[PDB]
């Protein structure tokens, strides 16, 4: 219902300063956290 992002008072640790996969990364050209791998790499 409450169409906006709802009030969470303590935003201390919701959006951690580190970023998990599939999350915004405000550094790179493509705003993206994955940074896909170079070809030829092997697990």
């Amino acid at each position: 219902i409450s169409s906006k992002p709802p009030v969470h008072p303590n935003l201390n640790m919701d959006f951690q300063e580190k970023f998990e996969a599939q999350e915004l990364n405000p550094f790179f050209a493509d705003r993206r956290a994955m940074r896909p791998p170079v070809p030829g790499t092997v697990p």
């Binding site: 409450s2 169409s3 906006k4 640790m13 993206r32």
Partner: protein, 207 residues
């Protein structure tokens, strides 16, 4: 001084009593500041891909059976079919350009419990929990209501009272699922056998 302050204990008492009444019949603490229908970049409209296209959920929400924090799909999934099915709309030119470029689709999200309380769908789904219970009945949902709060006090009611919810794992992703009668006793025989033993502790998700 004043003659009719016999009425003054009333507003002292009653307004103090109403202090309790207004406190507890007003809280709605994780039900009012949770639910919302956000405006995406394109509207996905789960209604259409599910409610009249008959797709189950593992198609584009892959890695929910095996991973933790299952993925929103890439753009590539839409390019399976929306490369050559529609090719017309002024609704997903972001999508076609995104496959033709590198800027991924600017997806907002919901259910974002904090990243100090981890979670794993596969730990649940493989053990028989359905999306009707937790992410709501999506089959008729143009945009996400997040009808469940996904807060702890509700997250934990299942880990204390699980057998009211868990599914038999046969066709778990079925929004039109009424469970059977004698549901509970048909379930506890699995917790006796499958031995799921849900967590009650701090170690599980908060680390």
């Amino acid at each position: 001084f004043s003659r009719k302050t016999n009425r003054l204990p009333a507003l002292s008492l009653a307004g103090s009593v109403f202090g309790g009444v207004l406190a507890v019949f007003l809280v709605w603490y994780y039900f009012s500041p949770e639910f919302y229908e956000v405006g995406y970049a394109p509207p996905y409209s789960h209604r259409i891909h599910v409610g009249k296209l008959g797709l189950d959920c593992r198609y584009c929400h892959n890695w929910v059976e095996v991973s933790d924090k299952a993925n929103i799909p890439p753009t590539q999934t839409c390019i399976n079919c929306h490369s050559q099915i529609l090719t017309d709309s002024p609704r997903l030119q972001a999508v076609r350009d995104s496959w033709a470029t590198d800027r991924s689709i600017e997806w907002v999200k919901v259910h974002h419990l904090p990243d100090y309380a981890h979670f794993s769908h596969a730990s649940h789904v493989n053990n028989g929990v359905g999306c009707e219970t937790c992410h709501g009945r999506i089959d008729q949902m143009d945009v996400v209501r997040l009808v469940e709060p996904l807060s702890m006090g509700w997250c934990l009611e299942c880990h204390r009272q699980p057998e009211l919810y868990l599914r038999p794992q046969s066709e778990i992703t079925t929004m039109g699922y009424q469970p059977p009668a004698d549901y509970i006793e048909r379930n506890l025989e699995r917790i006796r056998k499958e031995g799921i033993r849900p967590p009650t502790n701090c170690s599980a998700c908060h680390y």
